[PDB]
Amino acid sequence: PTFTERSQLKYARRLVVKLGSAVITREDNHGLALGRLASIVEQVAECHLEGREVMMVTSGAVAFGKQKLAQELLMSLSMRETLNLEPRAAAAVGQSGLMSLYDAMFAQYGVKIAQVLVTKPDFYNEETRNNLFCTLSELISLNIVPIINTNDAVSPPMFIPIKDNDSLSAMLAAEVQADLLILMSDVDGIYNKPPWEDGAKLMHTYTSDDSNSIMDSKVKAATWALDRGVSVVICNGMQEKAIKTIIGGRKVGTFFTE
Amino acid sequence: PTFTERSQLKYARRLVVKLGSAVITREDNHGLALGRLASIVEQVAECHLEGREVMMVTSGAVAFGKQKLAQELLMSLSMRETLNLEPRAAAAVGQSGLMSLYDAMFAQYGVKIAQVLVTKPDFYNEETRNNLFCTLSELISLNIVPIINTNDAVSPPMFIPIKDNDSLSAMLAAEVQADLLILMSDVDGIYNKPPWEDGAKLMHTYTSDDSNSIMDSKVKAATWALDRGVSVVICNGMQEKAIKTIIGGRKVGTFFTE
Amino acid sequence: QELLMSLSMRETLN
Amino acid sequence: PTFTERSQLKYARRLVVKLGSAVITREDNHGLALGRLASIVEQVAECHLEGREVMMVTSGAVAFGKQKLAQELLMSLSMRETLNLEPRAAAAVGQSGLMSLYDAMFAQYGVKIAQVLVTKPDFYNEETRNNLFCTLSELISLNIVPIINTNDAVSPPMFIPIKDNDSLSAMLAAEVQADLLILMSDVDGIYNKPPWEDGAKLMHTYTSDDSNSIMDSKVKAATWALDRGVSVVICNGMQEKAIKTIIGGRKVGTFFTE
Amino acid sequence: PTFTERSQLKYARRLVVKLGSAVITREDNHGLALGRLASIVEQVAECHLEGREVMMVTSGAVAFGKQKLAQELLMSLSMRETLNLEPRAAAAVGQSGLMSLYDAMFAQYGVKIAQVLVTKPDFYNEETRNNLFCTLSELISLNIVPIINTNDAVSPPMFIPIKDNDSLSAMLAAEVQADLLILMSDVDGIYNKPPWEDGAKLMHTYTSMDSKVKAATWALDRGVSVVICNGMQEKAIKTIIGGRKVGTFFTE
Amino acid sequence: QELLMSLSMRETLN
Amino acid sequence: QELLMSLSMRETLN
Amino acid sequence: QELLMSLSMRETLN
Ligand SMILES: Nc1ncnc2c1ncn2[C@@H]1O[C@H](COP(=O)(O)OP(=O)(O)O)[C@@H](O)[C@H]1O
Ligand SMILES: Nc1ncnc2c1ncn2[C@@H]1O[C@H](COP(=O)(O)OP(=O)(O)O)[C@@H](O)[C@H]1O
Ligand SMILES: Nc1ncnc2c1ncn2[C@@H]1O[C@H](COP(=O)(O)OP(=O)(O)O)[C@@H](O)[C@H]1O
Ligand SMILES: Nc1ncnc2c1ncn2[C@@H]1O[C@H](COP(=O)(O)OP(=O)(O)O)[C@@H](O)[C@H]1O
Ligand SMILES: N[C@H](CCC(=O)OP(=O)(O)O)C(=O)O
Ligand SMILES: N[C@H](CCC(=O)OP(=O)(O)O)C(=O)O
Ligand SMILES: N[C@H](CCC(=O)OP(=O)(O)O)C(=O)O
Ligand SMILES: N[C@H](CCC(=O)OP(=O)(O)O)C(=O)O
Ligand SMILES: [Mg+2]
Ligand SMILES: [Mg+2]
Ligand SMILES: [Mg+2]
Ligand SMILES: [Mg+2]
């Protein structure tokens, strides 16, 4: 990799920021988390109006869609039934709503966005893969923030092997040859033992050799994308000013390096 | 088909409205045509808040994207070069912008929309085709207006055989078993000889037998979708209150019937 | 009543 | 005045377009008329990206607010009351919603808008009047479209004497010394006798002398603003491409001249 | 007042939240602070979808307008001048843009907003004052969040005496007889001596910034109970109403 | 029932 | 040149 | 000058 110590992340030229699905929707499931969402959009816009080339891999279209569909189903019962959810339709509604919200929040900063929707078979056809990466590079070189997500509406991938919106981010940030990969999960980082025990220390540096022997999807994707040149940082999405302090060099999250 | 004379279109229960690409962008190519776009959205919202089940097959993501990319490329030259476009990137930018605009215009009426993006191989896998149609029926039965379009960003179909956003509309409105199919082209209808000649009368009723023997893509898709039960009406998108007078029964456009 | 008690909760609000 | 014959309106440098309240809301009162609204915004944006200095005097905040308040009041009854509107609150809600919609529709063209809210006592204080006109001129000289309206929320003027949103437009377009004043009413123009009679011809040119001796608010405001230099054109807002054919020189509406 | 100890703020039925002008725009002045703005809108929407009656007194239309006008003025010079701001116009542009943003962010939660613009002479005419308060009460009783601000576009009041967007908030929350008044300034609270000294402790309870102190003491003598907090803190309203020790609490 | 029949039409939809 | 160097920075971008 | 004449038209507007 090109970055070994955390003090060098100031010169990260190409980012790939992966927004989890617990960083978008609230715990009570009564709308979006505009706090975290708008704070991440603000940090990405101020890291993209600074020269870097950010490229977000969003998630959480299914959860947002499930909320919208629950509302539209509750608003269609008879007055008699009141007095006493498919993943694909949810994905459709949620993707539309989420892209509209991103569009508004980003246009508040003069930044423009684009919506690229990939699938699982688009990463086996060499022609389609090369076309996709030419498209991504061309969009990035025009100061446009692409927002990649799997086409959950017509062919969800759940039903490196792309099995979620994390292996997709690792494959992406390894082919575009990004410099830094920030996985904004909902946990503070990576512990040695699960948090509900005695000895649940945070690991501020995942040393490749030993720590590999002794969140499994995130660890697998991060180790893969690390063996390919990228340097991966796993942080907590529910923290204030996370990207701006990861790139700043302060000790935040887990930093996957040699 | 179920509708033979034009006076019976008042009872059309399931619509499929196909917006051409010349009904969305202006002739000078300096933005959208908010006039025609908002008028069609208003007619669809007032035909969907009336009991019908509308389902739009939009187009013109590539043109809108080409405009946005021309701007973002002109705003990135050096001050020295000023003093003396890929289809896929254009498709990405345009799809995002168009869905955001539809979202705003429809939410002005309380209506909700969903964005389903299909491709050419999604119509050969029987599993994927059946899943897509279950999704569409489930979205329609919740009073949500799906907005179908081909995934031009990663696999454009240009490069019944689905070759454009017209054969797609015919296949769609024949499988969902829609009642009416309205193709909003940019020409007043269908003439016997091209308009720039002597004898360029409009055909207010395309009688199946003879007229088949004596816009070729639109005619082919319309005849196909007519042999399958649907009844197709080709109208002029640049006309004021087109859908509301087609369904009203007034003589507008060409009506493909037996 | 039995017509006001058999409308969808969307028609009632309109 | 500076324009005597309708063929000279191509060189109109400063416009003042007054949108009536019947050009904004529909006849059934179930939302806005996005057709007419978006078409007028499109014509104003394409007449303002051409060098002119447009300045809209909007109306219809009370009607839009009344719709929103009827909804929010119907959605707050008990389930028991269901089974068997102040002008000021309506004005507040409607003004907010209308400005948001204008903002979206105009930003679709790169144009920026500003919201100036005047009252009746702000036209008697010479200090406040001069400050208001300095503000308007400064906003116009930055290629920003101001949108003037009376502060109906806290002091409606209904309850030259400014008695509505028409005398306001005449006073405005006479003090800013505009070149053309377009009153987009809901009637085709000005007839000699009311339309529901025999002899209801349209007057394509309101000759000052005779026609004065033989809609009374609009006529009074137009004659006033005509005696002050401005030249007033009264057209029908429910017509397609009204501003672009008035400025084009075609015979549309009534043209108040000497 | 009705609330004396901080543990009773859970039952605050009527709020009046005053957003400062340093809680809206960033320090570098290159756009809004969507972080703080969206977090406050989220807290107000989740405190208004819970039964309370929130009513925001926004500010910072002039700063946002100044940014927009600087852009539109820089984008209008000749190519030759490039190679080598009135408060009223700024107020107009900023008010429009801010209301549009609030509208979007609130409609993301199903909440509706209304824009009431008052001035200095509208608080002397008894008829106009009574009409304004009837309007506010009627808007609140329909589950609509009014957003009050001074009409800076045509008559800025800078040029209890209403001299800013703080005395306005105190007068408002004293006439509507609100229960709690939250002034979201940009400082952590109220210190005994200025922060850049030795002894700059925070006062967690002001036993009975000069403008904020004057307006708060006034609105306290009238029944309202005022809490001054730091707008740049995460989840400020939800922890003030929760009862946790945050900011300064003006009580007897 | 008499608790489900005395809620505002807004609480029922939530 | 002296016509391209006397346009407003808005006309150049259009 | 030759530094003001070699910036992208986006940096000049900021
Ligand atoms: N070794 C571990 N270290 C950290 N978290 C763990 C570990 N094992 C399990 N977890 C839990 O697994 C969860 C992983 O969340 P994740 O699937 O990344 O959320 P999302 O996909 O919605 O962003 C965390 O909430 C965490 O509590
Ligand atoms: N026989 C015909 N009848 C009508 N139009 C025709 C015919 N032959 C050619 N045309 C022309 O072909 C064009 C077809 O436009 P079309 O491809 O439908 O536009 P879009 O795909 O952008 O909606 C029309 O503009 C029309 O002028
Ligand atoms: N002499 C006249 N000429 C034209 N219209 C008239 C005349 N007398 C009455 N009217 C009617 O008066 C109405 C005036 O509408 P108006 O008040 O301008 O609507 P708005 O204020 O909502 O834009 C028109 O609808 C028209 O039918
Ligand atoms: N005694 C004091 N206690 C706290 N802050 C003080 C005091 N005296 C001066 N200040 C300073 O005065 C400033 C007041 O800010 P303020 O005018 O409320 O901002 P705004 O009006 O933009 O919200 C604070 O930034 C603070 O640093
Ligand atoms: N189909 C993807 C699912 C992604 C997903 O849920 O996984 P996660 O991002 O939580 O690790 C989506 O659009 O939400
Ligand atoms: N890929 C599709 C192209 C559709 C198209 O251009 O054909 P048309 O709708 O003009 O007949 C799109 O999103 O624009
Ligand atoms: N207070 C103004 C009323 C204007 C009005 O209704 O008169 P009109 O524009 O119909 O002639 C408003 O905001 O609607
Ligand atoms: N005219 C008001 C100014 C209010 C103001 O700046 O004072 P502050 O809210 O910072 O204490 C506005 O719209 O910003
Ligand atoms: Mg995962
Ligand atoms: Mg075609
Ligand atoms: Mg009138
Ligand atoms: Mg102050």
Residue numbers in the entry:
A (entry chain C), B (entry chain B), D (entry chain D): 45 to 128, 140 to 214, 228 to 282, 295 to 338
C (entry chain G), F (entry chain H), G (entry chain E), H (entry chain F): 115 to 128
E (entry chain A): 45 to 128, 140 to 214, 228 to 276, 295 to 338
Sentences from the paper on this structure:
The bifunctional enzyme Δ1-pyrroline-5-carboxylate synthase (P5CS) is vital to the synthesis of proline and ornithine, playing an essential role in human health and agriculture. The P5CS molecule contains two domains, GK and GPR, catalyzing the first and second steps in the biosynthesis of proline from glutamate. The GK domain catalyzes glutamate phosphorylation, and the GPR domain catalyzes the NADPH-dependent reduction of γ-glutamyl phosphate (G5P) to glutamate-γ-semialdehyde (GSA). Our results describe the assembly mechanism of P5CS filaments, in which the GK domain forms tetramer and the GPR domain forms dimer structure, and both domains form specific interaction interfaces.
In contrast, G5P and ADP extend towards each other in the P5CSMix filament, and glutamate at the binding site is converted into the intermediate G5P. At ABD of the P5CSMix filament, the phosphate donor ATP becomes an ADP, associating with an Mg2+. In the P5CSMix filament, the same segment shifts away from the top of the binding pocket and forms an open loop, in which residue M213 interacts with G5P. This helix-loop-helix structure is referred to as the ‘hook’ structure. The GK domain of each protomer rotates approximately 10° around its central axis, causing the horizontal compression of the GK domain dimer.
